[PDB]
Structures are given as structure tokens and as C-alpha cells.
Amino acid sequence: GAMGKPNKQIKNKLLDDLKNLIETANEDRKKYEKKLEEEPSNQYGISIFKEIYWVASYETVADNTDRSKNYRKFTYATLNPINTNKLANLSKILIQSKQKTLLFGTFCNLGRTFDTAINHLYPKKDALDKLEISNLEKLKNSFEKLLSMKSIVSDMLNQLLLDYQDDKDSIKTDIAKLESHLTELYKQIEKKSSQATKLKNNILSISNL
Numbered sequence: 001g002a003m004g005k006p007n008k009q010i011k012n013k014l015l016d017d018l019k020n021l022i023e024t025a026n027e028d029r030k031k032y033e034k035k036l037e038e039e040p041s042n043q044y045g046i047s048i049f050k051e052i053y054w055v056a057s058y059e060t061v062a063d064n065t066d067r068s069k070n071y072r073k074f075t076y077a078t079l080n081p082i083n084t085n086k087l088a089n090l091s092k093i094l095i096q097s098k099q100k101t102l103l104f105g106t107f108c109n110l111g112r113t114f115d116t117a118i119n120h121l122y123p124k125k126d127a128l129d130k131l132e133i134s135n136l137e138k139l140k141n142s143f144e145k146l147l148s149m150k151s152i153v154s155d156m157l158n159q160l161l162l163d164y165q166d167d168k169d170s171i172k173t174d175i176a177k178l179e180s181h182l183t184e185l186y187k188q189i190e191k192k193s194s195q196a197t198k199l200k201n202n203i204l205s206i207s208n209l
């Protein structure tokens with residue numbers, strides 16, 4: 001009979017959902033790691049890296065230092081889905097950002113938050129059955145939401161290319177409108193980035209395996 005609810009099954013769908021998000025996150029990671037390993041001398045034409053200095057330093061985010069290579073890697077994590085040959089156009093647009101140091105900082109932060117999450121979870125992708133079912137669900141939701149945040153930001157940056165292309169809202173022919181459009185875009189991205197930190201901490205706090 002007689003209209004039943006089942007736990008072991010609810011758990012299995014969450015586990016399978018998790019092993020799939022983790023696998024797909026990991027491919028994303030292998031792709032941005034490769035994007036750094038195979039970085040051209042001109043860094044895909046992202047010339048903005050050469051104008052972003054570490055806090056009390058002449059060293060740029062372009063330089064050949066571990067911290068500078070990670071910065072660029074975490075940036076590539078955020079720019080990962082955009083075709084590598086459009087990055088120079090994206091860069092040329094962002095040069096006109098009033099906040100490019102902050103904007104590139106959120107790129108990096110997003111990529112790093114993501115990388116920290118998949119780095120934590122990847123090795124545990126068969127130990128997740130150890131979790132209480134309820135924070136398995138919280139884990140699954142937080143991680144799915146975190147991947148989603150990163151996608152939305154890559155979509156927004158890809159959309160900026162097309163809107164510039166098409167002069168959406170005069171951004172291509174009126175520099176003042178581009179600037180305030182880039183400013184709004186920074187606010188939005190910064191927000192996703194804060195949200196991403198939260199989610200990452202959620203994930204870490206309840207998956208101490």
C-alpha cells in the first residue's frame with residue numbers, strides 16, 4: 001500500500017547529483033589549469049594584468065610569480081567558458097572600467113572560491129555517504145548554487161561582448177554609457193562573488209571529511 005513517502009533513495013539521488021556536480025566542476029578546473037599551463041606570452045591579450053599591482057609593490061599580476069600565476073588562473077576559472085580568442089576584445093572593453101582593479105579582483109576571488117570548493121570535494125567524492133542526509137542536502141545545494149554563480153558571471157561577461165558588438169544602449173559609441181554600464185556590471189559581479197564566499201564556507205563547514 002498505502003501512499004508511502006523513502007530515505008535511502010532520497011540519499012542516493014543527492015549522492016549521485018553530488019558526484020556529477022563534482023565531476024563537472026573538476027573538468028572545469030582541469031580546463032583552467034590547462035589554460036594557465038598553456039598561457040601565451042601575451043596572456044591571451046589580457047593586457048589589464050600588466051596594469052594591476054600587488055599592494056605595495058611594482059610586481060604586476062602579469063609577472064611570473066606563484067601569487068601572480070594563481071591570480072591569473074583564478075581569473076581564467078571565471079572567464080573559462082568564453083572562447084579564448086575573444087579575451088583580447090573583453091580586455092579592450094574592460095580597460096575603460098573605472099573599477100578594473102576591483103573587477104579583476106572579483107574575477108580572481110570567484111575563481112579561487114570555486115577552486116577551493118572543488119579542491120576540497122574532489123578527493124571525497126566517494127566518502128560523501130558519511131554525511132548526515134540533511135547537511136548532504138545543504139552541501140549539494142550550496143555546491144550547485146556555487147557552480148551556478150560562476151556560470152552566471154561567465155554569461156554576463158560573454159554578454160558584455162555581444163552588447164558592445166551591437167551597441168546595446170549606445171555603449172559602443174558613447175563612452176560615458178559604457179562606463180556606467182561597466183560600473184553596474186561590477187556591482188553585480190561583486191555581489192555574486194560575496195555570495196560565492198558564503199556558499200564556499202557553507203560547503204567547508206559541513207563537509208569535514
Ligand SMILES: *SC[C@H](NC(=O)CC[C@H](N)C(=O)O)C(=O)NCC(=O)O
Binds near residue numbers: 052067104105106108
Ligand atoms: S583571488 C585571491 C587573492 N587576491 C584577491 O582576490 C584580491 C585581488 C585584488 N583585490 C584585485 O586585483 O582587485 C590572492 O591572490 N591571494 C593570494 C595571496 O598571496 O594572498
